[PDB]
Design a binder for these strands. Structure first.
Lengths: 38, 176, 142, 209
RNA sequence: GCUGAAAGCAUCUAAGCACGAAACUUGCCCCGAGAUGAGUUCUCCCUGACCCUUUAAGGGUCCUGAAGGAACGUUGAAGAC
RNA sequence: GAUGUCGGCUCAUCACAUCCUGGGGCUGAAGUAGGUCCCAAGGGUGAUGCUGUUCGCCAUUUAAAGUGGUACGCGAGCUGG
RNA sequence: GUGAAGAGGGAAACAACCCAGACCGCCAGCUAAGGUCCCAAAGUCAUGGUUAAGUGGGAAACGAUGUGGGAAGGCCCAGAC
């Protein structure tokens, strides 16, 4: 998990989701692409 | 919304009860029922049901699509149900069913026993396979997830409980 | 001539029973407070309690809007330096359901001995059974 | 589960055959007689009220005498209540004796600790003493500071200070039951229990175990 | 995490359903009805006359003195008092 | 027309930007042991040689020897280097 | 300009900010700034919208399929995504 003020799609398999008021990036190919905004 | 446009076809032998919001499905596999959101029209018709929003309900189309999907899963529930398959990978790993309980030997210092819920049954063809059957898709998925959580597939050899149709994607340490 | 003043020994107070199920907490508590203080009577006097007795039934069925059922927090301090304690609205409804109504109304009542005397006439119940049939409370719609 | 009321008889030792000395407290548990049974319908909770010992007939007042007469039991030196578990059931006037602890193996003992009177902070709260020498001026066992300064501007509630020590209700948990002696009305527990010799103790099966 | 649409797919979430920490509420110990919102249970005691006017949760006289308490004394592993 | 100062001692109390213990994500995470971030303030969190020292450096521990606020917390509480 | 050397009303409290300049009395009326659910005087007013965070009722670069309005382009029943 990366906790950042600026979360972005780092590759094409990455998807921006909003889970309970938190903008999160869930990638299905690279685990170190997981981000939550905070 | 548009997923909700497509009606769900009622096959033969399965019948529908509608009490406004709570809807019950009967079939050869058993009783499935739920209460839909307050913002979805459900209407039994000629061997089909159709879903649509109420009035004065924002995002009634999303709820309509959700209700359509749940009802369609119910229909495939009371007929031929759902099956989930698990595989145990790793030396010494084993499974066995004793009635309503699965006994898992997953490398712990203690036995692991899982109590199946009401409408789910299990059977192990071999000692490293588990097959689950049931009418409720959500419940069988929950049980499979609970079984997997005991020993999640680790990323260096793939050892642990995993779904049969699952890709584990291992990795090497540094080199050699 | 001097204006009329209510005399505490000649005020006539009635008994009413309200049913709190499904009512918004604050919008019910406001009407409760104005009838406990007596602002609905033409004999209203700010220094004498001319209000009515109110019985509140089904205190655990009171309703809040938005996300207040899990986000409204009730703070209080015990007097010790650790002190500060809190409970959400759900926790209060689960433990002492009467106190959410009681402290809403108490917050909307005047402060001082007269306000406490006014609050003394509120009777809040969790069920829908009260013990004051001998007072013959009339049904009040809020 | 219900307990019993006894009195602290004193302390001794029990030698075991393999050469171990167990320090025991000797508790005299005469039969406790049930004086009143409380129920949900009448009282709101389930409990039994018991009495033990004896009292001088000229020292027991008319209200207490009438309360004893209703149960049909002789006056005792006091009355105690024990809360009732779900399975338990007792009748007024029934005697409960020490073989209740026949196979318990751990007890909770409650008594009143010995009164130390007014106690200083060094004894009451294990405060450290200040210097005996090296310039100290009349401040050898005094508490020291008790607050900070303007910003709090007060002493906090619950501050550790000198005052009454002891002479209060104390419980000691999970004491080994060494010996249950039915015809002697004796209970032998391992270790020390609160109070002085001849004081009343409430003995209950251990809640933590 | 499960099921799942909005967005024919994906998605732990929007509807719904699971787990999840010495933190929180309890569970353990102690105080605690001046909780003036002053609670409950059990037991005990007292069921005599008259007078006045200012008439009322009025005063006064005679007889009566309970259950209990206090006081005093001998004291305590209780205690500055 | 007076708000006593550094350090020590005694006694603390709060914050969390967490030192330990607790939970978790990622790892250039095989294991052991780590790195980094997230949650978490319940409890705990050294004795000394030197120096007035705070600090610091050393010597031995410890699960750890936290960072700060409180008139650089505390002299109608002590000391007075 | 105000305070100083100016009270009254508002800004919770709040010389210096907003309204406004107290000769005395009245248990009369209309207004200012600010307000009108309760504390606490007066709209739980009317009509049309927006917001779902208790935003309103503290804070930037920057980040995001959170929604409501424009304004115009692509791609599409010869089949688009």
């Amino acid at each position: 998990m990366k906790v950042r003020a600026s979360v972005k799609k780092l590759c094409r398999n990455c998807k921006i989701v909003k889970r309970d008021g938190v903008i999160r990036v869930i990638c299905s190919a690279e685990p170190k692409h997981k981000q939550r905004q905070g | 919304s548009r997923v909700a446009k497509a009606p769900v076809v009622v096959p033969a032998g399965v019948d529908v009860k509608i009490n406004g919001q709570v809807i019950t499905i009967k079939g050869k596999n058993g009783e499935l029922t739920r209460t839909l959101n307050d913002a979805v029209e459900v209407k039994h018709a000629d061997n089909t049901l159709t879903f649509g929003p109420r009035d004065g309900y924002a995002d009634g189309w999303a709820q309509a699509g959700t209700a359509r999907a749940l009802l369609n899963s119910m229909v495939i529930g009371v007929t031929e149900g759902f099956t989930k398959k698990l595989q145990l990978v790793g030396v010494g790993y084993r499974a066995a069913v004793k009635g309503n309980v699965i006994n898992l030997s997953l490398g712990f210092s203690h036995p692991v026993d899982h109590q199946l819920p009401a409408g789910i049954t299990a059977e192990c063809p071999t000692q490293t396979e588990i097959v689950l059957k049931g009418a409720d898709k959500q419940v069988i998925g929950q049980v499979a997830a609970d079984l997997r959580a005991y020993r999640r597939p680790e990323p260096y050899k793939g050892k642990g409980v995993r779904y049969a149709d699952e890709v584990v994607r291992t990795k090497e340490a540094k080199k050699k | 001539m001097k204006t009329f003043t209510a005399k505490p020994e000649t005020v006539k107070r009635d008994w009413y029973v309200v049913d709190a199920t499904g009512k918004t907490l604050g919008r019910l508590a406001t009407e409760l407070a104005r009838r406990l203080r007596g602002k609905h009577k033409a004999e209203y006097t700010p220094h004498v309690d001319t209000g009515d007795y109110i019985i509140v039934l089904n205190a655990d069925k009171v309703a809040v809007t938005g996300n207040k059922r899990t986000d409204k927090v009730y703070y209080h301090h015990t007097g010790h330096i650790g002190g500060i304690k809190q409970a959400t609205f759900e926790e209060m409804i689960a433990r002492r359901p009467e106190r959410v109504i009681e402290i809403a109304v108490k917050g909307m009542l005047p402060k001082g001995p007269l306000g406490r005397a006014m609050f003394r006439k509120l009777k809040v119940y969790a069920g829908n059974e009260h013990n004051h049939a001998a007072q013959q409370p009339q049904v009040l719609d809020i | 589960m219900i307990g019993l009321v006894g009195k602290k008889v004193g302390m001794t030792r029990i030698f075991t055959e393999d050469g171990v000395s167990i320090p025991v407290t000797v508790i005299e548990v005469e039969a406790n007689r049930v004086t009143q049974v409380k129920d949900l319908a009448n009282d709101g909770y389930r409990a039994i009220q018991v009495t033990t010992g004896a009292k001088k007939a000229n020292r027991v007042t008319k209200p207490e005498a009438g309360h004893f007469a209703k149960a049909g039991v002789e006056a005792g030196r006091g009355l105690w209540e024990f809360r009732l578990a779900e399975g338990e059931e007792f009748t007024v006037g029934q005697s409960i004796s020490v073989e209740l602890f026949a196979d318990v193996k751990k007890v909770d003992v409650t008594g009143t600790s010995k009164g130390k009177g007014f106690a200083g902070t060094v004894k009451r709260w294990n405060f450290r003493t200040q210097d005996a020498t090296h310039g100290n001026s009349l401040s050898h066992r005094v508490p020291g500071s008790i607050g900070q300064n303007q910003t709090p501007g007060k002493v906090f509630k619950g501050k550790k200070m000198a005052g009454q020590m002891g002479n209060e209700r104390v419980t000691v948990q999970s004491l080994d039951v060494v010996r249950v002696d039915a015809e002697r009305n004796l209970l032998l527990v391992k270790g020390a229990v609160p109070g002085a010799t001849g004081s009343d103790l409430i003995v209950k099966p251990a809640v933590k175990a």
